[PDB]
Amino acid sequence: LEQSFDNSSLISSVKELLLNKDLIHPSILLLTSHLAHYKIVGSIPRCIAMLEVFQIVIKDYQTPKGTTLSRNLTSYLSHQIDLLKKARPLSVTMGNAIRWLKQEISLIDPSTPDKAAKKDLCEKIGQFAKEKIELADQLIIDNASTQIEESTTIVTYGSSKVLTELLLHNAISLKKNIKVIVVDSRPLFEGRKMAETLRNAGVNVMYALITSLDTIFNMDVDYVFLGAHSILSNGFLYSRAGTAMLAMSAKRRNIPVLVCCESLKFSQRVQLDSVTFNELADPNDLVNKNILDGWQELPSLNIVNILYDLTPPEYIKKVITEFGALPPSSVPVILREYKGSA
């Protein structure tokens, strides 16, 4: 109660909406129970999953009697959004996809016989997942592969989103020597998902933990890469928690820090303090007769966890996006010149 941060209402832990007011798609109930119960995702996996379940929910139209397709679908899809809003708070890859999707719903005209609706929404959202995600990531690979010399190391963090393919490309498709160090954190052990895939493909993975973060950097080490959840308007990064400690340790021990991001993921909003806009994530996960049971019913005890916190832009040497490399203080110029306009 001294800082009162545990009563931050940016997430609501209410569950079990039983209301049959709308036709909630059973696939989207599978998607929400797949997100919120056992988190299998990063950010662009959530974006591709949300996008290819909205694919199915527009393919299964079921239009009402007197309402045109241009006058129902945004409210229907917003009530589809509300279940994910209950499940897990949204990324910017959520938001900059759904507002684009609503803008593309808006420019349809009341003459579609609900047969070309597929041909201008399914194909167009496939062009979105092609353009603003996948070939953009292909440009990320082809832009960041020239900035890695042979026989070096890489320290990623957590589950990567795009640069798993970068490490696989520079490991196998370009055959230059590389020694990836993957480090992750309690409780979402999502660096192991990178470690299984990278070592299954046959690259020198050396897993670690973030508590032992000192002894990684005392080896021969350079080129810390970082997956991003969003990049703010100032230059502050925003990603899975525990990123910023190895960011400040990496800048402290004068070895460079990079962020592989794409122009879909830049955000309009602004913050500079870490615990301001943030997600509380289910404090029963930090236990696994257990070690302790019942932080409740014991007065004066609490268990907190944080998913998201900010590296200051002094630490990131280079944000790379599909247009090119850039200093992190110069992200509003791609907020204004390229995001949305491309």
């Binding site: 402290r252 021990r253 004068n254 070895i255």
Partner: protein, 305 residues
Amino acid sequence: MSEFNITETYLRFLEEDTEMTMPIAAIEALVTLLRIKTPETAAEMINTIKSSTEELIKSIPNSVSLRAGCDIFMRFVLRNLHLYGDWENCKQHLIENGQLFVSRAKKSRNKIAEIGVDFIADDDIILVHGYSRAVFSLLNHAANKFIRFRCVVTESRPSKQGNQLYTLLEQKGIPVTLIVDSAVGAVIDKVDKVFVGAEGVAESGGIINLVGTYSVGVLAHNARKPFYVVTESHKFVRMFPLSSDDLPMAGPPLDFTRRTDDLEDALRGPTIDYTAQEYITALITDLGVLTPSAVSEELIKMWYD
């Protein structure tokens, strides 16, 4: 009958060996002063040695190692003047103590190595600055220990000393390069440990040796690489500056005069800088490894009264 002042005793044996340095040469000259000139009275002995120390400082002022030797000699004759032998034995007792420095301080340099070899660990790229021969006395025993390392030697403009190390431990058989002195900031991100050698230690821990050890120190701090300094125990001096500017050479470090026709223009700024106690992190003497607040206490206790 010599007079021990300038070159009738002192500068002769500097040509005997180019391994002995300036302060222990000063110690040897000052002990051989009263080893012979001892006119059976405690009064004029101290007047003679104080006059000799001040004229020897008057000979070469800009070589502050000389001041360190000529003042620890005064500490030697003060503590050996203590124990109060009524001067009856001390005419023999002090002179039979006497040559214990040239039997002691001459063999201090391998005693440096016997405690400083266990700093340079396996595969450490090392940065040294200037011909500080105690650093090479450590590095010689390090390479004789058969431990694996690499060395990088800076320039020593304008005092030429950086060219000597590359013709010193190359022939010992160590992989070594010679960086230029301005290129420190582009390489000190890669250098594991950096050694220097002092020509003096102030009352807080300071490096009063050469042109730019403050520059390599502040590069070491903003690379967060450990900044060690190898010295020995005849290098303590009372001179405790407060700026980055010491006693002058002949004028200020910022000249603005006019070159007349073709006179020399390189040595126009300073030549002996100063390092604060923050930038050094451990110094090596005969007294063990020594944190700079410990060298401050060690130079604060034997100089008060």
